[PDB]
């Protein structure tokens, strides 16, 4: 995260660390949607042009973390993945369309003050919150600068941006399964996600039920915090049905 602040303790209890078994290393962000299921971006597991194709084996999942680098001895919970599931139509070949993946844990995690699921939006929640100008919150242990690594989990709040503006800022083809966020050069307020923040949650607080919903997944972007450019996220609502589907065909 670029131009973010430190997260307070228990502020984003669904925040997950996608951790490599060896080299032991931060992979990406993810999010807890239940006691056995995790949501991340497919580009965290499979990205062939970079020879990236992680299996269940290769990874650990760490829940309830605050320190980026330390073993939080009786706070954090580490888990084994049972199986991994990628959108059958994830477009790694051209624009990260359908950048989403589910991970089912070997054993259900127990909730605590530091570990709690986020909600998945309903059709109605998406329509009232997903509006240009509305602010969302992104979190992660990612890059502080486009070109260190925070000690503690970082946070930033950014306004959703109009589709045209999104379209006009890149040469990459934007699909209805994506949305862009950030401030405008005019606005002069900054911040964005950065490498290492990928697969994390873009969350919103419903003003009607005062619950936190996950609207997006940190997907792609050109550099971090560049003026006139925005971050892009997978549109969670639009892929909800694939999600139900897989929960329904194999888990919980």
């Amino acid at each position: 995260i670029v131009e973010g602040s430190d997260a307070e303790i228990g502020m984003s209890p669904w925040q997950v660390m996608l951790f490599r078994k060896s080299p032991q290393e931060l992979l990406c962000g993810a999010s807890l949607i239940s006691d056995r299921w995790v949501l991340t971006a497919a580009h965290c597991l499979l990205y062939p042009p970079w020879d990236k194709n992680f299996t269940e084996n290769d990874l650990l999942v760490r829940i309830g973390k605050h320190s980026r680098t330390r073993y939080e001895r009786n706070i954090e919970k580490i888990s084994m993945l049972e199986k991994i599931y990628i959108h059958p139509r994830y477009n790694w070949r051209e624009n990260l369309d359908r950048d989403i993946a589910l991970m089912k844990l070997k054993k259900p995690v127990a909730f605590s003050d530091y570990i709690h699921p986020v909600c998945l939006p309903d059709r109605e929640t998406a329509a009232s919150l997903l509006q240009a100008g509305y602010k969302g919150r992104v979190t992660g242990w990612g890059n502080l600068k486009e070109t260190g690594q925070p000690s503690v989990l970082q946070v930033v709040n950014l306004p959703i941006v109009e589709r045209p503006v999104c379209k006009d800022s890149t040469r990459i083809r934007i699909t209805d399964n994506m949305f862009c966020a950030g401030y405008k050069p005019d606005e002069g307020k900054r911040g964005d996600a950065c490498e290492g923040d990928s697969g994390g949650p873009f969350v919103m607080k419903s003003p009607f039920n005062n619950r936190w919903y996950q609207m997006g997944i940190v997907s792609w972007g050109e550099g971090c915090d560049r003026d006139g450019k925005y971050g892009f996220y997978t549109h969670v609502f639009r892929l909800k049905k694939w999600i139900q589907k897989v929960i329904d065909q194999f888990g919980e």
């Binding site: 951790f19 078994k21 080299p23 032991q24 290393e25 931060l26 992979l27 990406c28 962000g29 971006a41 580009h43 965290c44 990205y47 970079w50 990236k52 650990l60 980026r68 680098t69 330390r70 073993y71 580490i78 990260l96 950048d99 992660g140 242990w141 990612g142 890059n143 690594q149 996600a193 950065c194 490498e195 290492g196 923040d197 990928s198 697969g199 994390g200 940190v218 997907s219 792609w220 050109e222």
Partner: peptide, 20 residues
């Protein structure tokens, strides 16, 4: 292009053998 990944420098604290 893609977040990609981040944090590779062993700068991390060893995790428990169990865990692993």
């Amino acid at each position: 292009x893609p977040r990609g990944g981040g944090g590779g420098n062993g700068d991390x604290e060893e995790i428990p053998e169990e865990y692993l």
